[PDB]
Amino acid sequence: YSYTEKKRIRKDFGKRPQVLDVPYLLSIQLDSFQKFIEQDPEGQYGLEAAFRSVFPIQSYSGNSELQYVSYRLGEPVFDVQECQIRGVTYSAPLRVKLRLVIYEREAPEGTVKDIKEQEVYMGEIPLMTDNGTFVINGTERVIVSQLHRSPGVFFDSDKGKTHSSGKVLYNARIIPYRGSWLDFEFDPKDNLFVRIDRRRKLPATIILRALNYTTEQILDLFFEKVIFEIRDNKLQMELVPERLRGETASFDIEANGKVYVEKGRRITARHIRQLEKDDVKLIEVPVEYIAGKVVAKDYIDESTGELICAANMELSLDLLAKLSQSGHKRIETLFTNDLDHGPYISETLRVDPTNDRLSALVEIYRMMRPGEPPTREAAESLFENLFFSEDRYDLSAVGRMKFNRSLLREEIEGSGILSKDDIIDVMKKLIDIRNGKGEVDDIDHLGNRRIRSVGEMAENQFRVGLVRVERAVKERLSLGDLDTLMPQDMINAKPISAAVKEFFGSSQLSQFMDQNNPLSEITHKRRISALGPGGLTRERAGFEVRDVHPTHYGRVCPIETPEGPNIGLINSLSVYAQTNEYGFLETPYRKVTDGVVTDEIHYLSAIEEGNYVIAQANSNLDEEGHFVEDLVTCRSKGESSLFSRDQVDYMDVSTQQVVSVGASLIPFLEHDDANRALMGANMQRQAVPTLRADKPLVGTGMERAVAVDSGVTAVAKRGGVVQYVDASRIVIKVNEDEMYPGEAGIDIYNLTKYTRSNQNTCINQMPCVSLGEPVERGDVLADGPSTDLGELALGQNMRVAFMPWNGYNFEDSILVSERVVQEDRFTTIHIQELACVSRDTKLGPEEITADIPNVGEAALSKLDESGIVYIGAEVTGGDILVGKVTPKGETQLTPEEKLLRAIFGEKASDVKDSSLRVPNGVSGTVIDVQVFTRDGVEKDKRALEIEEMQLKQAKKDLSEELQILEAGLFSRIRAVLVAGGVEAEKLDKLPRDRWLELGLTDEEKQNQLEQLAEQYDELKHEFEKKLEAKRRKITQGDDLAPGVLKIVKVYLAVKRRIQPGDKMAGRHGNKGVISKINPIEDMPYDENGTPVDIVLNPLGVPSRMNIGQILETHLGMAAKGIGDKINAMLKQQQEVAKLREFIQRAYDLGADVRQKVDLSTFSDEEVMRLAENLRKGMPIATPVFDGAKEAEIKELLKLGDLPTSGQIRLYDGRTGEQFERPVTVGYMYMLKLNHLVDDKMHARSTGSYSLVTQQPLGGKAQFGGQRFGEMEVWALEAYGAAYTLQEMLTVKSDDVNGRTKMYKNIVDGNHQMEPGMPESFNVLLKEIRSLGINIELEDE
Amino acid sequence: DMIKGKQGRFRQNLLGKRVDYSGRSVITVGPYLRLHQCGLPKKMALELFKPFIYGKLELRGLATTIKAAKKMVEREEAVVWDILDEVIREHPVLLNRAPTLHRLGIQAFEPVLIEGKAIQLHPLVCAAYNADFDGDQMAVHVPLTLEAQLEARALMMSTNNILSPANGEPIIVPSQDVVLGLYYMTRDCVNAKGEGMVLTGPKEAERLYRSGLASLHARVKVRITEYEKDANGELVAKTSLKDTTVGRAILWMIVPKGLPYSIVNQALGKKAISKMLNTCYRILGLKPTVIFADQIMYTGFAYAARSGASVGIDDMVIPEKKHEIISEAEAEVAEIQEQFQSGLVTAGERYNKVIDIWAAANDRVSKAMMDNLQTETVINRDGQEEKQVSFNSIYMMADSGARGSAAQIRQLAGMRGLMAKPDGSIIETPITANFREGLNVLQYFISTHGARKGLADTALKTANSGYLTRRLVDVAQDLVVTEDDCGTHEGIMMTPVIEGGDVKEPLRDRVLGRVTAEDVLKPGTADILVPRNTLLHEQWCDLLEENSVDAVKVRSVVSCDTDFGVCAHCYGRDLARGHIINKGEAIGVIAAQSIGEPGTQLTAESSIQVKNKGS
DNA sequence: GGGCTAATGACGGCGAATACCC
RNA sequence: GCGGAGAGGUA
DNA sequence: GGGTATTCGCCGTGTACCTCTCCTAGCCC
Ligand SMILES: Nc1ccn([C@@H]2O[C@H](COP(=O)(O)CP(=O)(O)OP(=O)(O)O)[C@@H](O)[C@H]2O)c(=O)n1
Ligand SMILES: [Mg+2]
Ligand SMILES: [Zn+2]
């Protein structure tokens, strides 16, 4: 085991051996943005692709080309932490190499001039942190992956609602990644219509017309010909027998001398077989049969030239006669089988008004840009750029792959632009499916839904910036002169940086990290949103869309999704799933070699999964990959059933791969109803870090994966030995193995102490390790918020008892014992940030001085001379948070008053105070203060203290590193000095600085001393410049917004204890409000005298079918019972032997388990340490579906000497009498959710009112009243309550004179009223009157 | 845009204002409360009643001027809290819960100052509010003027609203803990401590139970004196020896005089308690019903706590014969599938056969489980054994109607039946495992789909409901009861709707509280049974039951003759109160609300078969 | 900073405005 | 610093 | 021309509450 694992091992249930280990959980974001930057030669995914797509930018036929060489990412000026501190965006400057080339128009293309620009700067691009987030203005943002329809072609049905007479009308939609959309649809009259992206529906053939195809060419390409020969008389037809399938006979079908089908009897299969075996090709046919068909080609009179019948004209006897007399021997008709093969292109051609190419382009232009007269070349260019311009229309590699796969072409790699064959094949497939030789696609299939991660979306936005700047540069290069300008006046960075910061900051998919819990962060980063750009709106989306499709298996979590209005549109991604090369979703599976289940894993996407029969992970395999059962349970086409052993192609990797991380953390998921599991996961993501997080007694084993993969822990990069431990930094001396040969030094990890998270919670790291302990790469040095020794501790595990306790746990409410507040276990630290900004007004700049007009010295007492609160001062609502003064101008004081001002010291400049005050009703301690000045602003005292505090630390760190390197260099100088005449008595006792001034015999040794002296000088000079750089960064004004002189931020930290009304929850979907704090004595207690902590209502179990909490309680009681026994055996300190025996018998516990804990490592110390950590209760790991069965829980309870049934007899702490029917007690892992009553609670008597409609403000920040809505009005009307409603409508909110008169009347001790007319009604009159509508209040 | 639309105007600022003297907070249990009161945090109460505080402070002379009163409130000295207690005394406050579906979403209570930041809500009223203590919040308004105070305490107070305005039945019925406690109290057991001893009354029954000399449920002979108002409002004591449980006696202590003992004598589940409250209301009246409901709550909570009912993994018993049933059904499905591969039955027919056999197997396992769980306590009397309705905690939770239905019991201990795939088609293999056992990926996945679809349904359902109820309350708002009697003879002949097999809804409930259009005659002419328009109260309905009236013509609101409103008689009585409608009541809005609010849970014929022997 | 100028993923219902069929 | 968008969450 | 379909376009789509960022913009003097 690893060292952090050897510290405290977690007893893992679970029978099947894990073949694949959980991947890096944040793989999506990091890998996508890495792919985004990724300097790579061949243009694949990556910024490179965008540049080559948009560049080269050629003038409007001006012969001045612009070429792109390569780009470089500058080194970020600000690291992540400091960037968050200073409130700037963490980003990298982007520099691109360009060349301007100017040629000669009048000569064969040849470069006259080429100038190469010194890596022109084209704006800033934000970088992603190591953990996968973005700092955009000193706030951590996450870019959630987006689920959306993949480019390609889709054939939908849209039935049921078509005129309510059946008539299922099909449609083919071609959707590109970039470019306009194409749509082919039908109509009630089976005419197939095309509709450019979202316009009116035109006859489809026009696009075919636009493609330069003549009517005969089209009818050739689509319909199967039928030949009518005339030989010596009367119309003989070439017939393919198999074509007759299912056709009532219209004529007498005679052949080879014998009538086969009588005229009128429908062709039966017997007749079809007869004709097929006879090999009948041609038969003479009566003219009545042809009297109905349609003509394919446009048969002209070849002799004279006059046209007779046109292409796709219905045939009449007279036309047949004219054809026969004209001399046409071969007639090509159409095959219109009203059952299978319909006249669809024919009828579309009939409705199609356009004839020529030009008329088609004109109709197209009048569709795209209605109203402006179309000019020929405008239409030509429009149509060219629509679907065939490389720049505007690009499907993708993915789009093309899906397109070719849908139309059954072997070739995967195509051209981006929509070629004509593509469109023709699409229409062919549409009419094919319309005949019934094909299936429609289901949008909800994950094989049709693609995931756009960060890098892809960033690339799109960056391309958008490029298209902006390209148009701009285009115009500037066309109009302006060619040779004068150098390649930096020409290129503007503003649109690129504008687009990028717009996307990252103000976008639907770019959202705040839900950052109060490690689970919250990790789950937020691995999210798949169906909203955002080109995404369905949540309100519009139907219930059918938001359901969970069988394809989601092992790719998206079926159970973790917000239960709010956008249910089903969020879908957190499952544990093991990945994104394909093309952006699809794939899950690992184990290969099956016909008999043996091998160990090589293949990742399969949705479509590939669809074909095969996949076995489940929880299938019994014995020692050689063989199934124990003859018929095993699998799924083949989205439906599960039983298949034979020698049929399974793959098998699930592990039970967890179905569910997300959040759901994977819930123990005994297999016993919880899906609804309550859903709510449990969603809530569990809201837990707030407590003061000392400990661990779940009942976990799933995934805790370490989540904690490590989240960035909240501090993890070693190069393994070594812990040299120095402090509650701010851990300094480790590297091991020689991992030690770099040249310029290695040691590793130093600076920790972060209480800072503000997005949700205002505290983010503090504690050290785990001690001095002198060896650490390896990837161990957990320091615990982040709500994590312990590497494990996820979302909340805390307490002893609960399921029983109704005098209806104080009546509904989902929860009862809690005073011991819980006494032990200080649900107290969280929160942290508010406040900002006072001093800008520069034109009447004069505001000041931060402590001299504030007409404030008592009481308010200043807690302020320093600079005017900022002291760090550590306790404040309350209304106290002055920071001092600011508002300037006063045009004072125009009287001359005697001016003389009075001079003696008194009164300041005409002040007289008004803009000082920030602590908000009403919030009280805490000021833990930190920051000050940001712009250029030309003097540093305040606070600025000096904060700068010195950061600097002295930096100095210390540099000094420590330098001192180690100096000690090494001095040791080496001593090792050379010992050679060439040993001197050890005098040397070691004189100071070290008296070693450079000493000398030695002139030799090579003196040359080495000179070498080392110059190396010493070089280390000094590098140290000094690095120091200077650090000092320049510390001192510099931290660039503020235009107009702002300086800003002062103050952090308050507040310790919130649990109190009645707060919301508490479990992991299984059980919720509640803490209703009462009971004294310790009142709480139930078992015979032994230990009281319970929470008394939980049983009635929440049967109707809310979450049984996982009951098993969790039982197993948790078992684990805490064993832990209690080990604490008891340990307090008496029996001997190592007993402890090792007991712990081994516990860790083994039966068989078939994949644990294997030898306990051999470190015979004495490490075992004693591990016992010390388990004395508080041995942590279990039940995986989600490969969990602990009841019998195992019974065994574990027995090992602890506890009742096997998991229920105990309890004594009523108030009365002392026993409860009948023993009750379930045991430890369950409960969470305190972020919904704290003190944040929710709110009341107002009178306060500020709104501007336009003089009603009181809405909200909690500003006092704000409750909204007496229309439903409440109706409630009052249902009663006869006229006066209450009246006052509620006028005196309470809207009537100004009424409200003040009522205040005065109430104060007077009288209770009457004077309702008047609401001001909002008068506003209404004024607004309606602002239209041309006269609305008057009449009188008579 | 500013005028039209929800967010803009009329809806937002002219029917949806934002009052003063209002607050919001999380709701909490507070069992000790009276039906007509609510726990209110000190600090919100002070904030709300600020101007009252100033007025009273100035009247008492504690403050010279209003600013000194403000400063005294901002320090919050003991005098301020004393004045707040004194002013709060009879002042009622309005409690509201975010989705005010019907008029019981707003009710008035007398506040009691408490510590904490959460509002305490009386348990019995939660059903009216649809309130749950899992983070639900409530708003609290203060009526200012004297008419508003009187209106809040009279029309809106919790105790004045015990009957639903939609139908006449009680709204405040005990919900889950109360009913569980009462159920535990009344159920009897074959043998316990103190079997068959004779008690002189309930008081010594309590003496015995609280001292541990008798079980809370144990069959016993007790002498009891019930009261009956058989005469013209006088109570006559009848005193005899009944065979009951200790628990039933303990419960009888609360019951007011007028009620028959029989009421408590039974198992006393949800329905039994509800009809208990019903009879108490119909016989005695409002105030005794209120006090009796409070007593019921207290005793139920207390004895539920004394019961110690919990839920262990073993409380849900896997039927012993499950594995056999499942293996048999699997063999049968295998035979039918093989007999399909040979081609004697279509695919659809095979589907139907499998689905029906699986449904039958599900019913078999369910019935086996119910037999196992239901009556499994084979406990012994003095000698031989006997069997009885078990005391399995989950079973008591099922049968009492506190939580859970038979379906969920099935879902815990049996096989959890068939599921529907997205399109509505039913999967061939069911989920044989249950939550006591563990499902595997497929069965879970399927149930996940089910729950997901359910949730999305509830969301869209709520939106549609809200819209429908808005239209209803909107259309019928102006209708008011303006006249006492229009005097028309028109009316609708109302019959009981007997859809096919039996009487889905009887006459008595359909006609109760409607005035008659004309006198109806016995089956023999000139035998008038009901004078011209009379309100048909319970007594008339029972009288009609004694006779054999089948169809009754009653005056309806639709045919009412009154101009610009309706008349009291054409409408009838039905209300949260019992009496004929009062002139002035806005019946349109009450009707619209009553039709709208419940709208959130809304989603062969070869031979005729006579059900009962008749002509 | 100051001065000057200004696209594509709902759906149902209903009633009016053409399209067309005798 | 009254407002309105976007995102998320609660019942 | 007159009645009937069909396209077409507008109008609606639950309440109460709680967090956060972001808010006129671009070019020239
Ligand atoms: N989208 C939403 C979701 C919820 N709500 C509100 O949350 C409650 C749902 O209760 P409910 O009946 O659905 C669950 P509960 O009452 O606790 O009983 P149970 O758990 O034993 O089944 C209702 O008051 C709804 O108004 C809403 O307004 N809009
Ligand atoms: Mg609730
Ligand atoms: Zn009437």
Numbering used by the authors:
A (entry chain C): 3 to 1342
B (entry chain D): 329 to 931, 946 to 957
The authors write:
The structure of all cellular RNAPs resembles a crab claw, with the β and β′ subunits forming two “pincers” that surround the main channel of RNAP serving as the binding site for the DNA template. The pincer formed by the N-terminal and C-terminal regions of β′ subunit, also known as the “clamp,” has been shown to change its conformation during DNA binding and release. In proteobacteria including Escherichia coli, RNAP recycling is facilitated by RapA, a Swi/Snf2 protein superfamily ATPase. To understand the mechanism of RNAP recycling by RapA, we determined four sets of cryo-EM structures, including the RNAP EC, RNAP EC with RapA (EC–RapA), RNAP core enzyme (RNAP), and RNAP core enzyme with RapA (RNAP–RapA binary complex).
EC–RapA was reconstituted in vitro by mixing RNAP with a DNA/RNA scaffold to form the EC followed by adding RapA. The EC–RapA structure shows well-defined cryo-EM densities for RNAP (except ω subunit), RapA, and the nucleic acid scaffold except nontemplate DNA strand in the transcription bubble, and single-stranded RNA. The density for CMPCPP binding at the i + 1 site of RNAP was observed, but AMPPNP was not found in the RapA active site. RapA binds near the RNA exit channel of RNAP as observed in the X-ray crystal structure of EC–RapA. Nonetheless, the cryo-EM structure of EC–RapA revealed the RNAP-induced conformational changes of RapA including rotation of N-terminal domain (NTD; residues 1–109) and opening the ATP-binding site compared with its apo-form RapA structure. The RapA-NTD rotates 90° and swings away from the lobe 1 domain. The RapA-NTD rotation widens the RapA active site allosterically; motif V of the lobe 2 domain moves down toward a lobe 2 helix (residues 540–553). The spatial rearrangement of motif V, in turn, may facilitate diffusion of ATP into the active site of RapA, explaining enhancement of the ATPase activity of RapA upon binding to RNAP and EC.
